[PDB]
C-alpha cells in the first residue's frame, strides 16, 4: 500500500523507530563492555 508506506515515513513514526534501534544498540554495547571510563586502545 502506497498510503501505508507514506504513513510510515511521517516524522514521529520514523523518529520512534530510529530512536528505538539506537537505544537497543547502545544498551547492547554497554552490556558487552560494562563500566567504560577510559578509551584503553
Amino acid at each position: 500500500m502506497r498510503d501505508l508506506k507514506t504513513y510510515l515515513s511521517v516524522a514521529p513514526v520514523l523518529s520512534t523507530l530510529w530512536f528505538g534501534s539506537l537505544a537497543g544498540l547502545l544498551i547492547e554495547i554497554n552490556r558487552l563492555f560494562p563500566d567504560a571510563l577510559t578509551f584503553p586502545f
Partner: protein
C-alpha cells in the same frame, strides 16, 4: 435505527495529516501547524456541525478507552502471576512486603531489586492488588493467568466493537436522545445486576475460602471454589443454613440466613478489615435497591415518568418558570452533560478517598500504611482534576451552545442577571476566611517568637474547640443500642467508642480526637476550596460579556487578550480562569494530603507491645507543633525528609533521584510563566541568521510558542514537578518506617 456502511475503511486519510480541519489540511508553512495539529485533534465540534456525526464519533472512542483499560488490567493481573511473590505473601501477610515488578541488571540498576521477604527480590508495590486478590478467594497463579487471558480477550472484543459501531453500523441521532431508556438500563442492568452478581460470587466463593484462610489452613490445602458448589455438604458443614436450600428465601423465612448475612459492624480482629458477611448483605441490599430504582422512567409501555414533565412542574414565586426548558438543553449539548458528570465523578472520588481509610474494606489493609497513604492521595488528586474539568466544560458550553432564541431557560437567565452580587459576596467570604484562618497562624508564630506562649491559640492558652464535630462523634459512638438497635458495634472505630484493633503488633484503627489544631486546619481547607470555587465560577459566569469587554463571546472561548487598551486586558477569556484555578486546586489538595499524613503518623499509626502501650510513629506532636508555620516547616518537612535524602546506595534510591528530578521540572516551569512571547521570537531571529549563513535554514519557518501554549506548558510542568516531588517524598518516608 442505524446506517449501513457510512464511512469507508481506508489508509488514505492516514497519509494526509490535518484532514479533519480545512485550515490544517493546507500544509505546514510554519511550525505552529504542528502544534495546531495536536491541540484540535479531539474537538469533534469544530470538525463538523452535525450532531449525529459528533455523537457517532463520541460513541466509538469510549470503546477504545475501554480497550485500553482492559489491556491495563490484563497487564496488572499477568504481572502478579509471573513476577510476584503473592503465594509467599499469602502464607505470612504481616512480615512480607508485596512486590510485583523486577528489573534487568544492565547499568547497575539491579540495586533496585531489594529484599522484600519470601525469597523474592523486586520493587515493592503500593497499589493494594494483593489484598484485592486475597479478598476474592484467589489462591494460585493459574487463576491470575486465566484472568489476564480473559482481560486480553475482552480488550480485543472492545476494539472490534469500536470499529464495528463506526464503520459498519452507526446508530442514528434518535437512538442517542433516548435518555429514559438509557437511565433505566444503566440503573437496573449495569448497576443492579452487577451488584447482584458480585453478591453471588461473595456468597459462593469468597466466604468459605476466606473462612478457611482465617482459620489458619495452609492455602494449598483449601478446597477449590467449584468444590463448594458441587458438594453442598461442605457448605452445610461451614454454614448449616445452606442445608435448607432456597426454601427460606421463598417462604419469607429470611432470618435463617443470619449466619452469612450479618449486620455486625466494626472490624474483623484477625485481619483488621470489615466482615465479609456484612459486605455480602450490603451488596445484596444495594442490588435490590438499584433493581427497583430502574423502573421509574417511561418507555414503550406507557407506565413511568417523563423527565420533561417532572422538570416543567417545579417552579416558584422566586424563580419564575423554573426548570422548564432544561430538557432540550441537556439532550442537544454534549458539553453540559460532560461538565455535570465530571463534577459528580470528582465529588464521588473524593468521598471514596475519605471513606476507604476509616472503614478498611480489605483484609490486612489497615496495617499496610503505605497502601493506605497512596490510595488516599491518588484518589484525592483524581477528584480534584475532574472537578476542575467540570468548570472548564461548563465554560465551553456557555461560550458555544448558549442560544436563548431557541433554547430559553428561566433559571439560567436569572443567574446571569445578578452575577455581580454573587461574585462580590464570594469575594468577601474568601477574604474573611483568609483573614480569620491564616491570620491565626501568624499570630501564633509572632507570639511564640516574642516569648509569650500564654497568648497563643492553643489547647493550653486560648482554646478553639470544634464542638460541632465532637457532638457528631458522640452521637455516632452511641448509635448502637439507641438509634441503631440492630447494630452490634459502631460503623467506624474513629467515632470514639474506646476500643482498639491491633493486627500483628501494629495498630489498625482507634478513636481520633479533635482539638484546636483540627479547627484551624479545617478552616484552612474551607478557605482554599472557597477561593477555587470563586476563580472557577467567575470564569464561567463572565464568559460571554462583562463591563470591560461587551462582545467577549465573539472572540471565542480560548483567546489570549484584547490588546493593551482599557488599561490592559491580559487573561480575560474563560480558558485563563481554568489555568488560574488549577494552581489553587493544587494548593488545596497539597494542604489536605499533608494534613492527612501528619495526623495519621502522629495520632493513629504505631506499634503495640505486650503490656498494651502504644508508641506512635512521631509520638503525638501534631497537637502542639502544627499550630505554627515553623512547626510545619520543622517537625514535618525537615524531619520527615531525612528518609528520602538518605536513600542513596539502597533499594530506595529511585525515590531520591525522582525527588531532585521533580525539583528540576518544577523549577523549569517558571521560565514559561514569568516571560512573554516577543522576547523569544526576537531571539530566534538571530539564531535563524546563522543557519542561513551555512545553508541549513529549514523551509518550515521556526516560530515561538503562542501565548496560550506557553501558559499551558508552564502550568503542566508546574503541576508535574510539584506532584512528583510530593509522591517521591511520601513513598520514601512511608516505605522505610
Amino acid at each position: 435505527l442505524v446506517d449501513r456502511d457510512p464511512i469507508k475503511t481506508s489508509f488514505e486519510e492516514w497519509a494526509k495529516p490535518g484532514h479533519f480541519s480545512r485550515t490544517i489540511a493546507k500544509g505546514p508553512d510554519t511550525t505552529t501547524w504542528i502544534w495546531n495539529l495536536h491541540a484540535d485533534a479531539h474537538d469533534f465540534d469544530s470538525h463538523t456541525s452535525d450532531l449525529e456525526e459528533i455523537s457517532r464519533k463520541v460513541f466509538s472512542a469510549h470503546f477504545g478507552q475501554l480497550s485500553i483499560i482492559f489491556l491495563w488490567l490484563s497487564g496488572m493481573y499477568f504481572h502478579g502471576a509471573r513476577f510476584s511473590n503473592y503465594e509467599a505473601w499469602l502464607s505470612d501477610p504481616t512480615h512480607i512486603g508485596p512486590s510485583a515488578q523486577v528489573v534487568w541488571p544492565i547499568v547497575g540498576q539491579e540495586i533496585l531489586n531489594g529484599d522484600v521477604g519470601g525469597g523474592f527480590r523486586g520493587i515493592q508495590i503500593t497499589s493494594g492488588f494483593f489484598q484485592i486478590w486475597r479478598a476474592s478467594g484467589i489462591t494460585s497463579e493459574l487463576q491470575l493467568y486465566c484472568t489476564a487471558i480473559g482481560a486480553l480477550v475482552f480488550a480485543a472484543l472492545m476494539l472490534f466493537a469500536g470499529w464495528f459501531h463506526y464503520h459498519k453500523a452507526a446508530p442514528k441521532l434518535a437512538w442517542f436522545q433516548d435518555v429514559e431508556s438509557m437511565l433505566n438500563h444503566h440503573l437496573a442492568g449495569l448497576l443492579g445486576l452487577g451488584s447482584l452478581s458480585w453478591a453471588g460470587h461473595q456468597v459462593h466463593v469468597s466466604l468459605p475460602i476466606n473462612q478457611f484462610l482465617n482459620a489458619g489452613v495452609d492455602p494449598k490445602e483449601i478446597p477449590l471454589p467449584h468444590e463448594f458448589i458441587l458438594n453442598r455438604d461442605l457448605l452445610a458443614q461451614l454454614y448449616p443454613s445452606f442445608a435448607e436450600g432456597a426454601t427460606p428465601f421463598f417462604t419469607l423465612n429470611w432470618s435463617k440466613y443470619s449466619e452469612f448475612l450479618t449486620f455486625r459492624g466494626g472490624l474483623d480482629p484477625v485481619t483488621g478489615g470489615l466482615w465479609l458477611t456484612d459486605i455480602a448483605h450490603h451488596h445484596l441490599a444495594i442490588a435490590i435497591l438499584f433493581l427497583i430504582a430502574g423502573h421509574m422512567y417511561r418507555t414503550n409501555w406507557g407506565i413511568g415518568h417523563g423527565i420533561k414533565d417532572i422538570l416543567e412542574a417545579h417552579k416558584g414565586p422566586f424563580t419564575g418558570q423554573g426548570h422548564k426548558g432544561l430538557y432540550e438543553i441537556l439532550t442537544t449539548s454534549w458539553h453540559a452533560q460532560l461538565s455535570l458528570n465530571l463534577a459528580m465523578l470528582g465529588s464521588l472520588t473524593i468521598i471514596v478517598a475519605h471513606h476507604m481509610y476509616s472503614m478498611p474494606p480489605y483484609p490486612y489493609l489497615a496495617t499496610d500504611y503505605a497502601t493506605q497513604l497512596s490510595l488516599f492521595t491518588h484518589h484525592m488528586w483524581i477528584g480534584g482534576f475532574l472537578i476542575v474539568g467540570a468548570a472548564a466544560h461548563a465554560a465551553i458550553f456557555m461560550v458555544r451552545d448558549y442560544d436563548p432564541t431557541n433554547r430559553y431557560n428561566d433559571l439560567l437567565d436569572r443567574v446571569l442577571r445578578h452575577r455581580d452580587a454573587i461574585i462580590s459576596h464570594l469575594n468577601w467570604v474568601c477574604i474573611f476566611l483568609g483573614f480569620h484562618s491564616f491570620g491565626l497562624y501568624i499570630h501564633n508564630d509572632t507570639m511564640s517568637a516574642l516569648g509569650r506562649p500564654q497568648d497563643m491559640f492553643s489547647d493550653t492558652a486560648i482554646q478553639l474547640q470544634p464542638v460541632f464535630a465532637q457532638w457528631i462523634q458522640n452521637t455516632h459512638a452511641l448509635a448502637p443500642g439507641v438509634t441503631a438497635p440492630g447494630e452490634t458495634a459502631s460503623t467506624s472505630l474513629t467515632w470514639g467508642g474506646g476500643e482498639l484493633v491491633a493486627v500483628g503488633g501494629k495498630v489498625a484503627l482507634l478513636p481520633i480526637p479533635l482539638g484546636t489544631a483540627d479547627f484551624l486546619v479545617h478552616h484552612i481547607h474551607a478557605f482554599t476550596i472557597h477561593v477555587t470555587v470563586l476563580i472557577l465560577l467567575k470564569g464561567v459566569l463572565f464568559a460571554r460579556s462583562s463591563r470591560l469587554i461587551p462582545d467577549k463571546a465573539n472572540l471565542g472561548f480560548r483567546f489570549p487578550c484584547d490588546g493593551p487598551g482599557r488599561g490592559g486586558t491580559c487573561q480575560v477569556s474563560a480558558w485563563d480562569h481554568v489555568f488560574l484555578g488549577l494552581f489553587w486546586m493544587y494548593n488545596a489538595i497539597s494542604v489536605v494530603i499533608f494534613h492527612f499524613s501528619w495526623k495519621m503518623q502522629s495520632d493513629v499509626w504505631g506499634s503495640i507491645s505486650d503490656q498494651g502501650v502504644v508508641t506512635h510513629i512521631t509520638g503525638g506532636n501534631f497537637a502542639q507543633s502544627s499550630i505554627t508555620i515553623n512547626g510545619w516547616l520543622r517537625d514535618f518537612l525537615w524531619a520527615q525528609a531525612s528518609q528520602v535524602i538518605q536513600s542513596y546506595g539502597s533499594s530506595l534510591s529511585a525515590y531520591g533521584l525522582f525527588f531532585l528530578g521533580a525539583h528540576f521540572v518544577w523549577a523549569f516551569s517558571l521560565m514559561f510563566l514569568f516571560s512573554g512571547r516577543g522576547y523569544w521570537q526576537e531571539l530566534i531571529e538571530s539564531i535563524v541568521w546563522a543557519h542561513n549563513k551555512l545553508k541549513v535554514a529549514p523551509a518550515t519557518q521556526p516560530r515561538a510558542l503562542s501565548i496560550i501554549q506557553g501558559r499551558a506548558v508552564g502550568v503542566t510542568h508546574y503541576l508535574l514537578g510539584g506532584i512528583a516531588t510530593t509522591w517521591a517524598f511520601f513513598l520514601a518516608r512511608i516505605i522505610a518506617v
